[PDB]
Amino acid sequence: KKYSIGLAIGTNSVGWAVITDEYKVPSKKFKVLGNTDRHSIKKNLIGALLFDSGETAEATRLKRTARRRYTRRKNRICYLQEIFSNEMAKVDDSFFHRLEESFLVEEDKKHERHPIFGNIVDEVAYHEKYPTIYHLRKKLVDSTDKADLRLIYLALAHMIKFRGHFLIEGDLNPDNSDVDKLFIQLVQTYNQLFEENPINASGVDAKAILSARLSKSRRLENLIAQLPGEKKNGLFGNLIALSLGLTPNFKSNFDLAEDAKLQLSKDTYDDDLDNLLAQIGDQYADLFLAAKNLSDAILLSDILRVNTEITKAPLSASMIKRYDEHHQDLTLLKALVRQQLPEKYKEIFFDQSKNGYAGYIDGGASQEEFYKFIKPILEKMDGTEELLVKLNREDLLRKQRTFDNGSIPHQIHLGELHAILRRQEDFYPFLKDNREKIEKILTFRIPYYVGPLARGNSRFAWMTRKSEETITPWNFEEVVDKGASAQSFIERMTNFDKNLPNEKVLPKHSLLYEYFTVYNELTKVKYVTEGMRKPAFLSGEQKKAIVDLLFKTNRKVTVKQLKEDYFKKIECFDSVEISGVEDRFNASLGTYHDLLKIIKDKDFLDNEENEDILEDIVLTLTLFEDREMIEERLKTYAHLFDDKVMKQLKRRRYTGWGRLSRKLINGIRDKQSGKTILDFLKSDGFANRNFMQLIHDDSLTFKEDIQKAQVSGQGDSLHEHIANLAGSPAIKKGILQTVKVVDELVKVMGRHKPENIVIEMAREKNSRERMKRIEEGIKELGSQILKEHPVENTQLQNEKLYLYYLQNGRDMYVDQELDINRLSDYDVDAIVPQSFLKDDSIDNKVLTRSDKNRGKSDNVPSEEVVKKMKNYWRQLLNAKLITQRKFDNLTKAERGGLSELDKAGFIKRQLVETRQITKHVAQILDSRMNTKYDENDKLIREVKVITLKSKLVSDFRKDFQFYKVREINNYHHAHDAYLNAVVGTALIKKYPKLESEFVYGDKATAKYFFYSNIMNFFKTEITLAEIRKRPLIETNGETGEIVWDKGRDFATVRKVLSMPQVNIVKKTEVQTGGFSKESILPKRNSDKLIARKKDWDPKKYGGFDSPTVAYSVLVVAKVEKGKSKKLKSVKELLGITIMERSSFEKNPIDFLEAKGYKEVKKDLIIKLPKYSLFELENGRKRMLASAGELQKGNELALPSKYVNFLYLASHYEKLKGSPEDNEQKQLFVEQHKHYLDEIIEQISEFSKRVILADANLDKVLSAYNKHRDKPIREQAENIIHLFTLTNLGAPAAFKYFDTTIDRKRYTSTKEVLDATLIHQSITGLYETRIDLSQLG
RNA sequence: GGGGAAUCCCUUCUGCAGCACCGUUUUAGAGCUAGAAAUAGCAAGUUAAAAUAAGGCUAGUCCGUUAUCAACUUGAAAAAGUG
DNA sequence: CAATACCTGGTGCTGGAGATGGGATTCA
DNA sequence: CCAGGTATTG
Ligand SMILES: [K+]
Ligand SMILES: [K+]
Ligand SMILES: [K+]
Ligand SMILES: [K+]
Ligand SMILES: [K+]
Ligand SMILES: [K+]
Ligand SMILES: [K+]
Ligand SMILES: [K+]
Ligand SMILES: [K+]
Ligand SMILES: [Mg+2]
Ligand SMILES: [Mg+2]
DSSP states (O other): OOOOEEEEEEEEEEEEEEOOTTTTOOOOEEEEEEEESSSEEEEEEEEEEOOOOOOOSSHHHHHHHHHHHHHHHHHHHHHHHHHHHHHHHHOOOTHHHHHHHHHTTTOSSSSSSSSTTSSSHHHHHHHHHHHHHHHHHHHHHHOOOOOOOHHHHHHHHHHHOOOOOOOOOOOSSSSSSOHHHHHHHHHHHHHHHHTTSOOOOOOHHHHHHHHHHHHHHHHHHHHHHHHOOOOOOHHHHHHHHHTOOOOOOTTTGGTSSSOOOTTTTTTHHHHHHHHHHHHHHHHHHHHHHHHHHHHHHHHHHOOOOSSSSSOOOOHHHHHHHHHHHHHHHHHHHHHHHHHTTSSHHHHTTTOTTTTHHHHHSSEEEEEEEEEEHHHHHHHHHSHHHHHHHHHTOSSSOOOOOOOGGGBHHHHHHHHHHHEEEEEEEOOOHHHHHTHHHHHHHHHHOOOOOOOOSSSSSSSTTOOOOOSSSSSSSHHHHHBOOOOHHHHHHHHHHSBBBBBSSTTEETTOHHHHHHHHHHHHHHHHOOOEOHHHHHHHEOOHHHHHHIIIIITTTTOOOOOOOOIIIITTTTTTOOOOOSSSOOOOOOOOOHHHHHHHHHHOHHHHHOOOOOHHHHHHHHHHHHOOOHHHHHHHHGGGGGGGSSSHHHHHHOOOOOOOEEEEEHHHTOOOOOOOTTTOHHHHHHHTTTOOHHHHHHHHHTTSSSSHHHHHOOOOOOOOHHHHHHHHSSSSSHHHHHHHHHHHHHHHHHHHHHTTTOOOEEEEEOOOOOHHHHHHHHHHHHHHOOOOOHHHHOOEEEGSSSHHHHHHHHTBOOSSSSBBBGGGGGGGSSSSSSSSTTTTTTOOSSGGGEEEOOOOGSTTTSSSHHHHHHHHHHHHHHHHTTSSSSSSHHHHTTTTGGTTTSOOHHHHHHHHTTHHHHHHHHHHHHHHHHHOOOOHHHHHHHBBSEEEEEEEHHHHHHHHHHHHHHOOOTOOOOOOHHHHHHHHHHHHHHHHHHOOGHHHHHHHHHOHHHHHHHHHHHGGGGGGEEEEEOOOEEOOOOEOOTOOOOOEETTTTHHHHHHHOOOHHHHHOOOOOOOOOOOOOOOOOOOOOTTTBBBTTTOOOOOHHHHBBOOOOEEEEEEEEEEEEEETTTEEEEEEEEEEEEHHHHHHOOOOOHHHHTTTEEEEOOOEEEEEEOOOEEEEEEEOEESSSSSSOOEEEOOOOOOOHHHHHHHHHHHOOOOOOOOOHHHHHHHHHHHHTHHHHHHHHHHHIIIIIIIOOHHHHHHOOOHHHSSTTHHHHHHHHHHHHHHGGSSSSSSOOEEEETTEEOOBBBBBOOOGGGGGEEEEEESSSSSEEEEEEOOO
């Protein structure tokens, strides 16, 4: 008894099928367990497991870190309160107790209800004097009087609780505060450098123009307009643009060749500036640094909108400015509306439901919604011009706690905190003693490279301590070992050398590593001149000369340089042909040139004695990111360099790690030669063996030493192994389920292993990434396309509009603008034609007026287009608006275009799967199935694991009319698996040589023809560019075994796809995750509310509702009834919530008695997870959605003829085929038009038996009878929509044409308590059926 | 002969750590006047405290939403076994 | 009870490693 | 976007 298995692995399904020799699906009697009269049942061996998607760990992580931030913010306040404790007890012995209980109702409070002062006169007086906290903050910063200790606490607490961001290193307000003074200094520096062309900046109000609440480019336009004889793209204009935050190009200013694009925000600017300064000199450094200072002031002027010489609290004064203008503007708005629109006043100022001032202050209206609600009312009235100005500046009626306070750096709050401490330490000695402690509470951050400050009970922690004692913000540097911690942060993430598993890999930018990479590439270079008979390798002396003369004097070494600067200069060759490198060398000595710039001592770099020192320096610069730690580590070399060099050295940092270890590169030596790997790369006689040859050469000891160094460690379990794969957790869920399905199928077949296993694996928020890409690209481009055409992220889900913005509103094959409103008239074209590369992503598509203008449709865009457009394409590449892959495919015609080999490769790629994840699944199945070794100790492959891509069965389905309609039911997953088994087994039966291509385990026109016609053996006649005919029966050529009988096997496939009994099993799952919805609801007289804290009665405090049920439980017990508490027997479903789950499981009887049940039959408790399956009357099935709702449980097996009619009539897929075959399909659609009514009838019978939605079914029948005159295509398309009424699972809304059908829900689970519960194995072939009516 | 390696250019995704700003919720910020009352007319509004999974023991400036799960038998569990 | 309409926490930033698909040079 | 919880309305 021989059989094969087909598998269809997806993110929400695993289809499976068992086939025999004749491509038939077996069927068996399977035993049924349980308490019903059915002892067995007949099952076909085909089906599909369905399951909810596996989730990433991201949401879990974001909640976990937020949790930590709330804990630490609370600890911050606790540190401050501990510092204040004793002196506060002398002033007000319960002040902190009133703060802690502020949330409680007066009934529950233990102290007086007024928090700050504990009496109403003083509390009212406080709020009258300080209407916002920022009033109190400003007062305490500016005033010189002794102040109440409770107000000092509230000010410091407010700063420490909401302390601002940490994006700026170092201290602030370093005389970079004033925009006027920094603009003056920029003009002074510029006029120093350009005495003949000076700028007249008198009368120019730089403060107002650059700090105006306007766009960067408009402020640039304003300032340049104030300077006659200067254009925005001149040098001074470009400096101002750089200060405002734009991305100016300094190339034309200094007549450069290298594009000097500079943005002060990019990480590369530090290098991008030195780069530019290398071409123009360092006299200009003082200029570009002057512009940088100006930017800081301009950034500060966005936050601090008040004169900094009238107060040391400009932030608080700016909030107070918000409050005063809010008050004045509210008074004016009230008066204006009173006078002009007196009837709207109540709606504006009393109705929280509307987006007026009432809904803005008390309702749910945001600042944006309120501005939208009141803009027409202001434009409608008179005297609202200044209010409209403030509204369009987003500066009308502002609150102080707003979404845009994310700009505020912590140094600002720190400045006010420090000033308050300096004022009041003169009156409170403990503030003087604790001033720096309090500052440290605000400033201290746990470094990202330290992680949680755990003590052995966190699986996320890596931090190590220097001493075992509690860590505080003040003892952190002494208790935490930051060095060891930062080292572990990297090392727990980096790979070891695979060749020497106990050796750490080198830093990617290490000098040794770059020598290795350069010599490895250079040793395989060959050259020819005239008098030479044969190309020659470079000798050791030639390679050393090329390294010293070229690689150690240029960052990049081109082939032109090799030819001219070496072969001409040294070897006296006028012509020489180079091979083994193209255009320029890929490897380079970048660190060598970095350090040469920093330390300026070539002889230090070239002296092998300093090799270790330079290796340790780069290691430090790679391993650590903190400049203080870097400085501490480099301190041991301080005596070798100057303090200037040491400062430049610590500012230089690298990231990234190599893939080989130092011990491998330059440690182990060949036993007889005594030479390391690097020694061989430098000089290897005339063989010039590279890395691969060296470690694979049996005459050297490298290979054997690698073999000895290997280890294996502890083996992963199957689950572990799958978890460590690279891929989406969703597809990893499908992989594990697939393995479990195969194990059960083998057990079904009497532990006999199959002959073949054929696997196919499906292909695999976003709008904000689209908007970010376009914003970055457009601002890098310097374009105003977002000025002229504002777009929202949702709109970018349109493919053409997204392409329009990515192309800067231009045609891509023609140098012309496109029109947004004409997008429907344009074409979206494939760069590499989709007949070769089935790529439909933006990486292979392009928006053009007319696809004709590409050239010839059979290849890459033509050479003429490439000559026209390569410059524009390069700008798109630099702005990252197209990728390197896209640019290379666009420009390929200048490299010969598509060769015949490229076309052969693309066709083969459409058939031979090469994704890494599918290889891993095949390796897993193959290593589980094949475990024995033969006489030569080689693996015995009893089971061939075959992998196919989806196109094979898809083309098979379309070519032989086995069409799929996904919406009809879930059978197509199973059918896909069946067709994979059939096609895959037949393919390797017919062409066993292709086993290397499709089976796991160890001329261009010819292969193009071959792989294009690989599947023709299925056809009876093939029309290929004339008509050839194949025999009825197809056999293998060598064995003579039959592989495909076209008279009998297609009938077998048809019968298999027509079987109505298919094992669709929805994986039952316990629900996990959040306890409930997160919304904190207002107080309500409802027992659905859940307390947010143990003592917060939700009727007084509000709280949550809508908990998630982890699983339901069948309880058979008694409950008290009536005022007499009489015991009445019950049987019901109790949903255990996720929050309740631990308590219920720790002791179920006590849990159930607490819920009210008595005398619980403990052994009749049935755990019922989501999607538990119940069967009622007439085959009607239901699934548990929760404890109080059910899902649909039945599948609608629509006969094959109706499915194929629906596919053809609806044009479900593209109308590909001969026009005569198109006509025959159209003729069949029209000859079988009565099928439409029959399909409705099939749906109707099904619903009346199983769905029971009388209102919906009647609305549907009326809708179908309403559009009987509609075209057949559209009626078929809408019949596809109808199947939502019958689909398995949760009910859902759908539309028949323009009629909307709302979902009919099953809001009661009472009936399943007397139905039959069905427990299903993973395949559903094994069942346990429990008649629940026999309980109770 | 290699779906194996290094390098260059990138693309995409997965794991983790550190931080900010809002939002919500209860309370505090004396509403006034005319009416016996429902109510009417007016005044006012911007701020704060505290919580932000209930909580846990291991008591850390730690942990608490990912992954994994038919039933049954033997099991404390892990597990293995059962058609 | 069964049916209907409404609800549903969100945004921004910093740092690091790996594997990954695929074009290119050299190899095993 | 799904789809289960919830209060309103009968
Ligand atoms: K009280
Ligand atoms: K000008
Ligand atoms: K609001
Ligand atoms: K190259
Ligand atoms: K680093
Ligand atoms: K020195
Ligand atoms: K789960
Ligand atoms: K889930
Ligand atoms: K199951
Ligand atoms: Mg907490
Ligand atoms: Mg708040």
